[PDB]
């Protein structure tokens, strides 16, 4: 379709003129931010991004692309690189290092400067970095974790954790040498590192000895308790602290949230992660929205500020199965979580950062004709005489042989939440890539953030900007 | 391989540090652009970026991710939305449009507003939007265009042509109606138009009548003149202008160059496009540097200051190939003429953008080990037993089936410069991909280039800073 407004060169000419008008009103604070909010949407590189603003504006009434996401209307931009020390193409485990600690490390491993090695529980002491949560909290300050995942997994382990493997979930993941040497549990480590003050998201099965019914799924016995040790680290956690709750529902958490006198809050709302947002259950279940909503209303009470982790945890899960429609609505759910953070905070003394930790093999090409669904068809057909789908990817299950040929597909086909798009070589998961990723900010020392840096960057402005961590100091006024 | 000096928390912690006190140091300045030049890197998006800096990196000393491109050096990024008004994914004519003139249109035109329909030649008029090098020139200033294609291919035309089909580079191709009704190829759009001072690229065949010989090829008939009208556009452009000279050698180039008193320079050196930098006569062709370099000889003349079009055009080339070793090495040579043209020129009176059209299905995946060639194989094999390369495309012709099975591939195959990378779907070309790209500013006002734009922004911030266009009366301070 070809939108009659556009034909017109005054269009774009006032449009231009506006973004003229608007770049030149901006100005660096000299005033340091209160608070520090990074969204981490997992997995959602640049082609992600494009694609989520083309269907989040079809789902509103229009065309697509060029209806603004909330993390497009942040004002200042970098591309980011995301190499780890050992591998190209990264993971998220030392990416989070990178993002939140300020360090690059090796692939797998979580808190631990490139000296460690993965899966080598003896290389761990002396290499530990700590978090500018970590930091944050030292400084006084209320700090929350907020996912869609287990917050036992790689990113929001990466705010508290310090592990030579990410996959150390709970003391049953532990090898008997490991634990004989002293090497905790991430689950363990997310109660007794550090005070942490919202923790909301998946993850319940970690915290309670095997044999534990979860309570949402007591007649499924995989869903149980895994602990080894016997502990009960939910107890545990309460016990340590006055006014602390914990929930497992959506019912409790916004109760939770409304009460002064809670200070404390532990919600994990499914024994793993939760579930995508196309299944999610709105009686039960928390959105990322409403995670956020109820975190931000007990940090900010806070007179000193917060920090809070929020990551879109599942944009990755999605594209790892070649199920664009599930990694694009997980997107949209994300950029609705940063545009609520942005209705309850205030750009005058909070630096906010939307970033993600590595990209996916994902593609978005053909030459599909202006407001065409993005689960649709390339215009015309293929060589082999067969439809191909506008979304693909390099690698990845999606990837197809039937009676040696690769198959045809139609628009219901393709527009359905179970497709999978097609890929060139078969994975059982479709690969993270390597290239460059996008940062958002805005706020107080937001200005800051340009250009091409590395990733580590990203947790060096959000100390820089709260005059934390190795830069108490800065040269900045208060908030 | 894990480099030492990584390992330790404080490489990370001083580089971060350096790269706070850069950010912390730049100032917006208050004065004008005397010069503008626009770098455009054909099919080059974000995944292109990083795998060009990998490559590059390993062609010097180095492990690859950590060595800066010249273009990862400009203190300005922007992401820039790529959509032409009817297609989600665009081409080179219609996103031409919006960088050169600031106004989208629609798919295979140029230098239209989006009324006018592709191929219809009485559509045209009433439509015609004018570049900002087209107002550089009315405003006094010398312009000059450069390019590895044809100077009549869709990127370079945007700066001089109105056409609604792009494919109409000499009278041969433009249907006898069309040509009844005064639609005027690219080619005598070129000489025509306006005053060009530098035109320097392919595309010698177009200028000449049918049987003219090519004078590097004057026994392949096919390289020939094409023109039925009997014109030599050469002769005509030279005959229009005191100091002008042709030449179609890189000798005589660099000899021009250097003659103050040639004042206007059309330098062609294939019939077609130039060839791939892999396959350049180094006595008979100039480089894309030497272009770039000779460009700048004469444009520096004029004390009112010049408007520059240097192109990496053959990226694009690669990618459509799926041969990744083209697209790359492409890439780099466009690297090294943005780093000689920034030795060239001053940034205290130059803005300098670097960008791309449009992206590619080009993707960098497998988890490959730190200083590995980014044309190796993926570590592990895949699902269906055979190896894999790091670099896909999403589709295109390295799509294969022998003896109806994907092909096991090795590593000196795929570092070969004929290798094509597989894709999920076949076609003859690889197709564009409608992602996000970058936009790298340095210079006066490139402070402007921020967040997420139209394309169109790179036009109407280029237009500013030098105080053309709608935008006499910017506020601005002379350069
Ligand atoms: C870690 O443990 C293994 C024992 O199997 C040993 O080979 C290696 O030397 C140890 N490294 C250190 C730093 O002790
Ligand atoms: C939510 O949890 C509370 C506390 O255990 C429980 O009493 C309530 O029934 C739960 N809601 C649902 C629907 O299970
Ligand atoms: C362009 O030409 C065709 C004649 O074949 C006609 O159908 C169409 O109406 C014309 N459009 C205009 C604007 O004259
Ligand atoms: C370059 O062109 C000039 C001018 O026609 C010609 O005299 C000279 O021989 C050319 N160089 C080569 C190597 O062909
Ligand atoms: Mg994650
Ligand atoms: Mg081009
Ligand atoms: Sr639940
Ligand atoms: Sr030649
Ligand atoms: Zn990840
Ligand atoms: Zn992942
Ligand atoms: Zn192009
Ligand atoms: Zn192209």
Redesign the interface.
Known sequence: ???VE????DF??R???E??GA??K?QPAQTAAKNLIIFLGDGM???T???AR?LKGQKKDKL???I?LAM????????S?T???????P?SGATAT?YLC???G??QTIGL???ARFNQCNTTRGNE?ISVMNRAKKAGKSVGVVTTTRVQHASPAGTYAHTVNRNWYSDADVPASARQEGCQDIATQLISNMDIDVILGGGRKYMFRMGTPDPEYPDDYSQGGTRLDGKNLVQEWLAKRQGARYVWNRTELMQASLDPSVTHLMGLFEPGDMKYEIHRDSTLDPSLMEMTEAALRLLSRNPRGFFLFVEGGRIDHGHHESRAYRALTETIMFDDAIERAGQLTSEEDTLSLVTADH????????????G?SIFGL?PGK???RKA?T?L????GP??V?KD?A?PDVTESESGSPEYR????????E???????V?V?ARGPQA????????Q??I???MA?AACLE??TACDLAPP
Chains 1, 2 share one sequence.
């Open positions: 379709i070809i939108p556009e034909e017109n060169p774009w000419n449009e231009a003129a973004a003229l770049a030149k901006l590189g640049v082609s991004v494009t694609a083309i697509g692309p060029e603004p497009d209307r942040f004002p200042y931009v970098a591309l690189k190499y780890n020390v050992d591998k190209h193409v993971d990178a300020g360090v690059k090796n692939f400067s490139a000296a970095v990209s996916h093999v994902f593609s978005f090409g053909g030459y599909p004709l202006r065409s390339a293929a060589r082999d191909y506008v693909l990817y390099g690698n999606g990837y042989l040696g690769r798009q097609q890929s060139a070589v078969p994975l059982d479709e690969t993270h890539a390597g290239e460059d996008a958002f200005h800051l953030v340009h250009g091409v840096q590395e580590t960057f947790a060096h402005v820089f190795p830069y």
